[PDB]
Amino acid sequence: SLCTRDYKITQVLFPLLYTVLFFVGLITNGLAMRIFFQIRSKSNFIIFLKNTVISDLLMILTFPFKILSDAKTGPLRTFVCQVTSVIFYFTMYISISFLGLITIDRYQKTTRPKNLLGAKILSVVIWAFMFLLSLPNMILTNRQPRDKNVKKCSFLKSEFGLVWHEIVNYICQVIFWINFLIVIVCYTLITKELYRSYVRTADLEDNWETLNDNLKVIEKADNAAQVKDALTKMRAAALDAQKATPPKLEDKSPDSPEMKDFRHGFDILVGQIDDALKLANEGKVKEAQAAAEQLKTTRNAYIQKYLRGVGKVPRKKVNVKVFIIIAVFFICFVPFHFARIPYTLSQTRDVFDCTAENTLFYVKESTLWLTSLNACLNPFIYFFLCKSF
Numbered sequence: 385s386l387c388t389r390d391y392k393i394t395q396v397l398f399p400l401l402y403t404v405l406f407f408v409g410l411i412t413n414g415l416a417m418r419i420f421f422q423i424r425s426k427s428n429f430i431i432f433l434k435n436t437v438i439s440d441l442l443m444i445l446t447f448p449f450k451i452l453s454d455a456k457t458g459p460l461r462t463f464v465c466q467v468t469s470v471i472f473y474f475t476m477y478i479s480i481s482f483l484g485l486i487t488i489d490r491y492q493k494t495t496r497p498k499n500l501l502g503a504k505i506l507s508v509v510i511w512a513f514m515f516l517l518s519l520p521n522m523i524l525t526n527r528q529p530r531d532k533n534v535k536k537c538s539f540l541k542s543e544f545g546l547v548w549h550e551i552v553n554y555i556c557q558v559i560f561w562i563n564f565l566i567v568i569v570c571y572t573l574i575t576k577e578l579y580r581s582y583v584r585t586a587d588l589e590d591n592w593e594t595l596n597d598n599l600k601v602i603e604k605a606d607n608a609a610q611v612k613d614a615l616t617k618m619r620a621a622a623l624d625a626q627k628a629t630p631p632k633l634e635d636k637s638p639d640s641p642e643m644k645d646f647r648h649g650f651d652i653l654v655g656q657i658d659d660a661l662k663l664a665n666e667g668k669v670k671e672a673q674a675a676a677e678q679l680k681t682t683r684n685a686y687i688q689k690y691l692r693g694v695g696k697v698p699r700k701k702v703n704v705k706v707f708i709i710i711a712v713f714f715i716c717f718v719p720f721h722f723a724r725i726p727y728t729l730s731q732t733r734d735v736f737d738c739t740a741e742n743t744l745f746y747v748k749e750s751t752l753w754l755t756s757l758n759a760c761l762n763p764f765i766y767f768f769l770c771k772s773f
């Protein structure tokens with residue numbers, strides 16, 4: 385009512401920071417639209433990112449109206465409170481909702497029209513839901529601005545309008561946390577799968593060590609008993625690695641040629657150990673060592689290089705796209721939603737002190753800037769792809 389807010393810093397710092405976002409964002413979205421609208425909608429991920437790029441556009445279009453209003457209350461600030469600021473929040477939760485759907489879609493592809501119709505109807509669901517939340521926030525901004533200095537939208541809203549403001553901010557907390565928990569669960573399952581794929585590849589490489597290091601002992605061996613002990617250990621290690629299922633041959637049947645090449649590949653190496661085993665059983669040292677050294681030949685070394693390469697962890701396991709989403713959530717959306725509820729409470733009722741209401745506003749405005757940073761960082765999911773370079 386009689387509270388004074390220090391605008392000496394916010395009128396220089398924030399319009400300058402938002403000029404940078406408006407500049408970068410238009411270049412980023414300019415490149416994103418000419419790349420995404422020139423390609424067809426053959427997958428669900430393309431449809432969701434085609435909707436995210438048009439939502440990012442409306443978010444960037446809001447910034448010039450904020451640059452002028454924060455720099456200077458008047459008819460411009462009244463309009464910002466009524467139209468542009470509401471549009472910013474509308475497209476923000478649209479971007480969050482689609483980011484959650486992109487995380488689910490990309491997670492389902494790591495585990496493996498009617499499929500495309502589902503993605504298209506879910507797009508309509510998000511756009512209609514957020515508009516039905518934003519529309520009353522625009523209409524109910526009806527209260528005469530008595531003073532030309534009091535720059536707060538809560539003071540320009542009616543009794544029912546202030547109630548709808550409190551409801552929407554709670555619904556938006558539910559919208560954020562449902563999408564944020566979706567991104568956490570998906571990421572955890574991917575990271576858990578990466579550990580499971582690592583252990584299986586580590587056990588495969590350990591069998592190769594109890595085949596390479598044991599062969600070095602045979603080269604320095606003197607008695608027939610020392611060669612016979614190492615030959616039995618090498619045969620067991622090669623047999624154990626043959627039974628193993630690598631992460632590359634995960635979605636492959638045991639009757640497939642790819643699975644058969646891996647099984648027979650080890651049998652060629654097992655055979656050479658078995659040939660030297662017959663010589664070692666009799667009591668031969670030089671005759672058994674010559675047959676054991678046949679595993680180091682140009683042809684057999686290629687087989688060892690092939691079987692090791694098949695065992696290796698693929699790039700399909702390392703999901704960079706889901707990690708970009710979780711990083712965007714922690715930097716852009718998490719700090720903002722951790723300061724919205726204490727700020728919304730100071731807006732609904734004049735219960736806080738002048739210094740208390742001011743401190744909450746500066747924290748809200750600073751965190752709101754990081755939320756705006758997502759609009760210039762969201763098309764990077766498209767830029768870090770195979771068909772984008």
Ligand SMILES: CSc1nc(N)c2ncn([C@@H]3O[C@H](COP(=O)(O)OP(=O)(O)OP(=O)(O)O)[C@@H](O)[C@H]3O)c2n1
Nearest residue numbers: 465469470473474517518521535536537538549553556
């Ligand atoms: C999906 S539509 C939506 N979602 C919100 N979370 C949301 N939060 C606030 N709004 C609406 O956006 C308008 C201004 O938001 P605001 O953050 O309360 O204004 P402000 O940052 O200038 O804070 P004050 O100076 O008003 O205290 C206002 O009409 C309000 O009803 C919102 N609209």
